[model samples]
Target: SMNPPPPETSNPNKPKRQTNQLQYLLRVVLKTLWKHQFAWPFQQPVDAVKLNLPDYYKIIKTPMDMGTIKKRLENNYYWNAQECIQDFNTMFTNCYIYNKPGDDIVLMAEALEKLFLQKINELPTE
Candidate 1:
């Protein structure tokens, strides 16, 4: 009788896999929106009002790499104005770092608020 094959050794150095199903679905929806011209400088309305969320969720469940996820997020930025706004807001908020006793948080907050408001006001009204 032939000897049984040795047990496979587990690789401890391999990178851990992580998945965010929601992020994946959002990516697909965003890509579809982009393909249909729902991208930035939105000149027209989206034709497809229906989205199969279940199917999209399933598609995202497939194993993927971090680079793929990052790319998807980048593409999503092109399609969703809300995502862009949120990202900008996040960046703006994070730019300020205040750590001091009795610090002028109000003043700092007001300055940032004003800056954002001014920028928003400057955009062309739809």
Candidate 2:
């Protein structure tokens, strides 16, 4: 008689397989964001003192950037897609809050936000 395979052994690896599938999509989104023209300001951490925005840290306690996000992505620091997406949103929101509504930086942030939403929406669903 034929025997069934070990469900117990296979079950442990299922979550990891699912995570890898989503991780690839997230990486693609990240690369696209990096290539965006308005991505320069958000490529790295904000230099509050050098840029003369002394209150930056005080206002935005959790500063996010592409470089940091990339690092976290590569390191598997994110447990789910929402965590990665949320980081990008936070970065854009931070820019909008720090700069004036009419400022070019604020406009760039809006553009970046739109592109991000578009890209993620294009991802395949379960």
Instruction: Assess the local accuracy of residue 119 in candidate 1 as a C-alpha lDDT between 0 and 100.
Output: 49
Query: Clashes in model 1: which pairs?
Result: none
Q: Model 1 off-target regions past 4 Å?
A: 1-78, 88-102
Each prediction's number of clashing residue pairs:
0, 0
Cα deviation of 20 in candidate 2 (Å)? 5.4
lDDT of each: 0.34, 0.72
Model 1 per-residue lDDT tens digits across residues 1-114: 222232222334533332343343345433433343212212121111242223322222222222232343544322443434453344324323222333454344344445
lDDT of 1: 0.34
Q: Residue 65 deviation, candidate 1, in Å?
A: 24
lDDT of 2 by residue, 11-82 (tens): 233343347435654567888888999989888887766677757777887778887787666656665777
Model 2, global lDDT: 0.72
